[PDB]
Design a protein around this nucleic acid. Structure first.
Ligand SMILES: Nc1nc2c(ncn2[C@H]2C[C@H](O)[C@@H](COP(=O)(O)OP(=O)(O)CP(=O)(O)O)O2)c(=O)[nH]1
Ligand SMILES: [Cl-]
Ligand SMILES: [Cl-]
Ligand SMILES: [Cl-]
Ligand SMILES: [Cl-]
Ligand SMILES: [Cl-]
Ligand SMILES: [Mg+2]
Ligand code: NA
Ligand code: NA
Ligand code: NA
Length: 326
DNA sequence: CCGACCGCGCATCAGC
DNA sequence: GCTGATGCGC
DNA sequence: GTCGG
């Protein structure tokens, strides 16, 4: 919040480039700058001071001067007044509707929450659930509620097979007092990078969760990735809790650390760390860390027995989850 | 300059 | 049916 | 939009 004005501005510019301009790199450029400045322990007094941080170049430096001077940015004021941009931005807030779909809907006159509702026939399954819970997915989840959700999931998973290990990751694992959703890493001895000794490993869990009415909907589902909706049970006479987004990722047991590193994030932190890995000659995904051969082709998985082993490989001092919130 | 910008699962489409 | 490109998301 | 070679 120290530099909240500036970071909000950069985020708005990032989302604009992503949703309207469909310019992913400009999007990521603004995000990075926002991230670097959010972490900066001083109240920025000028663009120049900001340019000193990696990620802030000449352009963002100017915008920061304009912002610090007037408390606003013309580029944004104009964008806010543009109907197409505003429409596209709004629609992209529905889960399942990205930049393309949003622009197409607008081409059909479907630009508001009202238009989306009377045109359900024009939405795929995911987008349909996104609209249904449009308001709920906008609410944050207090950590207290994340703890109740954690307890349900672990206990339910345990009932299916005592050997399943479910680990809540994402911002929750990073210690956040509130999370946008719940992220669950799931492992089972029958599933290793070596073999899948038992089928329906993810299915059984999803099934058990739906049975106790925890999982309410399904956006998408595969052998290793589940993307849906869940809701805590409410007591007698009390207003029921909001529906929450939930992701469940089944990863080979023997590749847990690369998996938990990945799911703990943050997303930006992962991008920076993977980028750094490359510079050091490695490549990192959710399954392994491999060296980059002379020809650039990835080599064989390197042995890993902790998240720290991954950090060491790329010559980075270990960073506890709570400090990976970039 | 100017090329790189992390890496991957699922849903959906077009071409065969 | 399949493979691959594209959208969307984590 | 920013950066490093
Ligand atoms: N390499 C990558 N990894 C990624 C990426 N997007 C997401 N992720 C990883 C890291 C996230 O923590 C994790 C969960 O995804 P989530 O969106 O839930 O992020 P949280 O950190 O939990 C913030 P919250 O608002 O939900 O509290 O998935 C990506 O582009 N590239
Ligand atoms: Cl771009
Ligand atoms: Cl503004
Ligand atoms: Cl691992
Ligand atoms: Cl791999
Ligand atoms: Cl921590
Ligand atoms: Mg999350
Ligand atoms: Na800079
Ligand atoms: Na969306
Ligand atoms: Na998530």
């Amino acid at each position: 919040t120290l530099n909240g004005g500036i970071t909000d501005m950069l985020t708005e510019l990032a989302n604009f480039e992503k949703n309207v301009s469909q310019a992913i790199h400009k999007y990521n450029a603004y995000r990075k700058a926002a991230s670097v400045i959010a972490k900066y322990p001083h109240k920025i007094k000028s663009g120049a001071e900001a340019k000193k941080l990696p990620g802030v170049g000449t352009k963002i430096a100017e915008k920061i001067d304009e912002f610090l001077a007037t408390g606003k940015l013309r580029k944004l004021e104009k964008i806010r007044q543009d109907d197409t941009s505003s429409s596209i931005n709004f629609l992209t807030r529905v889960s399942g509707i990205g930049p393309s779909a949003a622009r197409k809907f607008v081409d059909e006159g479907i630009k508001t929450l009202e238009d989306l509702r009377k045109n359900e026939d024009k939405l795929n399954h995911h987008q349909r659930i996104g609209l249904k819970y449009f308001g709920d997915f906008e609410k944050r989840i207090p950590r207290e509620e994340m703890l109740q959700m954690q307890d349900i999931v672990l206990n339910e998973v345990k009932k299916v097979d005592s050997e399943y290990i479910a680990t809540v990751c994402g911002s929750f694992r990073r210690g956040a007092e509130s999370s946008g959703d719940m992220d669950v890493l799931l492992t089972h001895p029958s599933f290793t990078s070596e073999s899948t000794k038992q089928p329906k490993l993810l299915h059984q869990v999803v099934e058990q969760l739906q049975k106790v009415h925890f999982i309410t909907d399904t956006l998408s589902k595969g052998e290793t990735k589940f993307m849906g909706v869940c809701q805590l049970p409410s007591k007698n006479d009390e207003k029921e809790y909001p529906h929450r987004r939930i992701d469940i990722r089944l990863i080979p047991k023997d590749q847990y650390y690369c998996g938990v590193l990945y799911f703990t994030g943050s997303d930006i932190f992962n991008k920076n760390m993977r980028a750094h890995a490359l510079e050091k000659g490695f490549t990192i995904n959710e399954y392994t860390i491999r060296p980059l051969g002379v020809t650039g082709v990835a080599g064989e998985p390197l042995p890993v027995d902790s998240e720290k082993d991954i950090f060491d490989y790329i010559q980075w001092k270990y960073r506890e989850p709570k400090d990976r919130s970039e």
